[PDB]
Amino acid sequence: MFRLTRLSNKPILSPIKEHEWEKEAVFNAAVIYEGNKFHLFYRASNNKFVLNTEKPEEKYKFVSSIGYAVSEDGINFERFDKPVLVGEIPQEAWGVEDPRITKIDNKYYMLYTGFGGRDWLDFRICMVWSDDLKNWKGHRIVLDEPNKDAALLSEKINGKYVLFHRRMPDIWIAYSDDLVNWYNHKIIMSPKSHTWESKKIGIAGPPIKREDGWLLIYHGVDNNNVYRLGVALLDLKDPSKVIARQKEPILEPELDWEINGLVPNVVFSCGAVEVNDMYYVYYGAADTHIGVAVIEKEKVKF
Amino acid sequence: AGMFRLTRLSNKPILSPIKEHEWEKEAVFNAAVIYEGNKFHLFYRASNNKFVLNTEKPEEKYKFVSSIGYAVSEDGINFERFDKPVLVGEIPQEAWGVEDPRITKIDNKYYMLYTGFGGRDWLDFRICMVWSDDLKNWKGHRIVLDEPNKDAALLSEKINGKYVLFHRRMPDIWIAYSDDLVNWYNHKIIMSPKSHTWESKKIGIAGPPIKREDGWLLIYHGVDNNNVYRLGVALLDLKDPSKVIARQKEPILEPELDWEINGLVPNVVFSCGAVEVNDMYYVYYGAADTHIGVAVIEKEKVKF
Amino acid sequence: MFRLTRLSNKPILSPIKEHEWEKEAVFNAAVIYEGNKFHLFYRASNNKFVLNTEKPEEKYKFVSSIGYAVSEDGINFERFDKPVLVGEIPQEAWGVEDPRITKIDNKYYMLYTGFGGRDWLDFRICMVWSDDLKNWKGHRIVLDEPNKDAALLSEKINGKYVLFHRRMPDIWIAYSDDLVNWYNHKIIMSPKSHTWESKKIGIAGPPIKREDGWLLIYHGVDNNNVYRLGVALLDLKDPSKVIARQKEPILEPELDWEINGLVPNVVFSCGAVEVNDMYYVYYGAADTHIGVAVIEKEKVKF
Amino acid sequence: FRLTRLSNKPILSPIKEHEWEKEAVFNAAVIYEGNKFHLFYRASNNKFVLNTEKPEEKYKFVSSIGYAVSEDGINFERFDKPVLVGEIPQEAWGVEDPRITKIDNKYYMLYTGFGGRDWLDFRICMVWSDDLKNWKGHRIVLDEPNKDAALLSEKINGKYVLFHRRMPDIWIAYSDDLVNWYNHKIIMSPKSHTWESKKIGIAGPPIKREDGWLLIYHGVDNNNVYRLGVALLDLKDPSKVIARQKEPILEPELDWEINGLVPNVVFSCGAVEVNDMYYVYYGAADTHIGVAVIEKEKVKF
């Protein structure tokens, strides 16, 4: 069994008080390694998160945006003044959350949760795409249902686009010919009772291709809503089949900025990249900061 | 294999929703059919909305309402339709509407069995029944069984002076008998799903059984572990329709076309009605809970 | 990868309409093999089982009794005119259910469900014992709580008596110094979501000792309340640890009198014995009849 | 280090003649005043069916708080009737696990009020007295399923300090006024794959030392065994744990700690410094009260 190792005992990205769109939280970041650079697309909030009201209240409204950051080394990032993605009004009035970015044939697809704030089920999987990581277009609701924790596979299977999603509480898979209409829905992995992953699970970042399968980092939620990261392996030719699944988490809230924050007891990844035989896993910490942790590819054994 | 299958009559739906009609804005599907007066009489389920089914409870913000529409055809392919549904859910006992009608003619009366859905929880459904003399003036509504239950049809004649009801306490096809079309007794399971097959999660009757010389033709739907709906066939003993004397292993219809694979509920073919015309079985089927198609098989090809 | 084979396509015991106490059902039978004879202690009902009322109602009252039958060949049994155990009033006023009998040293312990009918939770694990399978005494409430599916291990572990029980929906284990007071409660086995054993599980008969561990036949209930038998293997020295568990059931309702009956879709075993290098598994069918199915001991492989 | 029991027998046990303490006496708060041990103990009229989907009227148990006094800390005098019972519907199933803290010249008793309507229908409640006899001013401390609550015996920077237990951690919070709590944070967490893996909660109120605040706590393992552990809080900032012992200081060992209404439980709501010793009173199997001690000089991390 193997574990992620943190590159820092401090966040690598933290809120910026003088930018309203990110003055309270930066977390749950997609990442893509291209042009020998880490391109990070992070969720950012203008406010703390009041989640225990009967409905989302205007007086506690938070708005998520997607910011951009770039790094040579994966640790030190240059950041920018304005977010690169904001929500459309009114269906995404409370913003755009938890992006997962997948490259498929020289196009970049960002899958995110659009949240309208009209009730606590007013969220859905949305998708935009670009050819340059810069000019995002083609917005669509991927599944018109309350759903999230979505990612595209980086290649087609038998000609079909492959979507991971999360009808509560399982990781689901589905297929598409046109990136519009989805079919062959199937549960692929389920929570495990009396474990750290008992309440619900969901995909982390998009799966990483290996020789032995697709690496599926995921998050598991226990009975007290603690988020941890786990890891499984999907079959290479049929990624709807799980062929291995580690019992122990690979990352858990441990540092004080992972245990305490806007949402306590959370580590959460929307993105991970392979650079020089190392997996770099970017993670939100307590829905407040961003950390990064790694594992050598050789140590990934099932 | 040495099996038989339906042949689609057309590669496009024979009925589609109409966006300008609220009551059939998103879906027309799961249709009852009666051949009378040399006309196909089709009674289709229609929905005003998509089907969000993954919530823990039915949510009013995702409410869908099913109505039952009427369409009529001479060739079984091209249908005339109408502005308004012929049956709606009475509010609030059938607040989310009336679903999947099955129509059976017995002694010059027509009996429409449908699922009434109140939407108060996911078990808030029941078999209801209305009847008519003329396929036009439905009346006599009743709850057939006071229990969560659906996939119900009456047999077209009595057996030893008893009415025969097919129903579906999850996950099996059940039979039951009545003297008065009000009280049912001697409930028995007659057919069950088969593990590790296309019909593993649950089964239910399709349309009402069709009388043959060799028995009762029982088209049914089977649901696999991923909730794909396919159609199968079995044969019931002519004198005792509680006994299955044959059952084909492989389905006779399954999602193939894009408008059967993709739709409001992906991967569904579902029949509520099939009729014998000029020694062919015309099987009308909902497709992805969105459109209606028709498939056929020559009566002589039904061999087990 | 292994399954039971029915010895008969008809019940070996059925209700006796002339006997009020066993007029509607005989099922869920404990089994002891002694004196070259099969001893069956079967649940018997005077009535069908209406269960869908807010509370247990006198007009739907059913009474469970425990009858006895004995067989040399395992198929033809000698039966008796009256039951050998009936419920004490008021705590067992609706009778005594699903006995499991374990021989520990030279005493036989029968654990059964006493059902008082005062509420749907008005049931508990009770125990009586005998040295001769004839004179039962020493009645006690094993756990003073709603609980069932109980059996004693046939020997002590580290000087402790071992109890298997079923706080919903798991198979539990507990230990005792004195067969009165129980401690070290532990979940040992849980349902598995999206399978035939998703809703709940419970022990079948008392576990059978093998060289490679304890054979733990159990029942699993799916989302449609279908009851099937499965099989696991517990560690020989620490039976609280499961070392193997077959994925597929070993017995499922298939025959008309297993699928149809007072409670549809049930096969349920309260006893299994080893006879001539074969396991004999007696089972209730549709809570109405008793069947028997076997497996050659050499075919029990995980 | 570890605690040492003073008796291999309970020092308090249920009295079947008294309905309110018919089945159990356990989880007792204590303070030392007037050179007397004042013990405030939870008491139940019934066994504890916990495995139902919701709490059932047919299996209802009612906790009361009783009073007992001792001079040696071992032999206690007891009384016919409880001192606190549930008055209102939020306390329909009674009042549980009191922790008493003296701040300025007043005594505050924080306890769990349990309404029995569902298994989350429990709240941290508080009453207070001048005299340990007349409790007043009942309030819900936090309007949320929470328990294992205690007040610090002093203010920090003029703020009252509350320890609580949003599952599964020990939390701290601050109040200007004992009404509104803010700056909630997690100060200590379970350790997975150990005796304290499933959840932890404060025991009695922390005891002031010169090296910090002594934080006895209970840990719960994967099989629901309750044991006691000990940690040390920074003296000036009790949100900071500066030491924590790996192994328990008390676990079920005697037969009336292993066996009982809730097996495999030792649990303390109360401990006091008396003659250079910590006296740790504990419930055992949620059925009896025992007491164990440690020489304060022996407390080393």
Ligand SMILES: OC[C@@H]1O[C@@H](O[C@@H]2[C@H](O)[C@H](O)[C@H](O)O[C@H]2CO)[C@@H](O)[C@@H](O)[C@@H]1O
């Ligand atoms: O998309 C909105 C989203 O909701 C939150 O997720 C969960 C949800 O609101 C509910 O409260 C559930 O029981 O717990 C929350 C997570 O465990 C967060 O993901 C939040 O950041 C988002 O706005």
Ligand SMILES: OC[C@@H]1O[C@@H](O[C@@H]2[C@H](O)[C@H](O)[C@H](O)O[C@H]2CO)[C@@H](O)[C@@H](O)[C@@H]1O
């Ligand atoms: O009668 C309501 C009915 O429910 C749906 O049926 C199924 C049910 O909701 C459950 O979710 C099952 O597992 O999946 C659905 C179909 O498999 C639909 O039939 C729906 O159209 C109806 O309103």
Ligand SMILES: OC[C@@H]1O[C@@H](O[C@@H]2[C@H](O)[C@H](O)[C@H](O)O[C@H]2CO)[C@@H](O)[C@@H](O)[C@@H]1O
């Ligand atoms: O001990 C009474 C016992 O109850 C039944 O078990 C279950 C129970 O009544 C409840 O309805 C639950 O939801 O499902 C039942 C079985 O799945 C039977 O075991 C019955 O025969 C017994 O009297």
Ligand SMILES: OC[C@@H]1O[C@@H](O[C@@H]2[C@H](O)[C@H](O)[C@H](O)O[C@H]2CO)[C@@H](O)[C@@H](O)[C@@H]1O
């Ligand atoms: O305040 C009610 C309280 O509940 C019990 O606590 C726990 C709870 O019911 C739940 O079942 C948990 O998993 O285990 C119980 C103890 O670990 C007891 O503390 C009980 O005495 C109280 O009444």
Ligand SMILES: [Zn+2]
């Ligand atoms: Zn700026």
Ligand SMILES: [Zn+2]
């Ligand atoms: Zn959107």
Ligand SMILES: [Zn+2]
């Ligand atoms: Zn699931």
Ligand SMILES: [Zn+2]
């Ligand atoms: Zn998630």
Ligand SMILES: [Zn+2]
């Ligand atoms: Zn772990």
Ligand SMILES: [Zn+2]
């Ligand atoms: Zn029109």
Ligand SMILES: [Zn+2]
């Ligand atoms: Zn109706």
Ligand SMILES: [Zn+2]
């Ligand atoms: Zn059906």
Ligand SMILES: [Zn+2]
């Ligand atoms: Zn095909």
Ligand SMILES: [Zn+2]
């Ligand atoms: Zn007789």
Ligand SMILES: [Zn+2]
């Ligand atoms: Zn009893």
Ligand SMILES: [Zn+2]
């Ligand atoms: Zn469980």
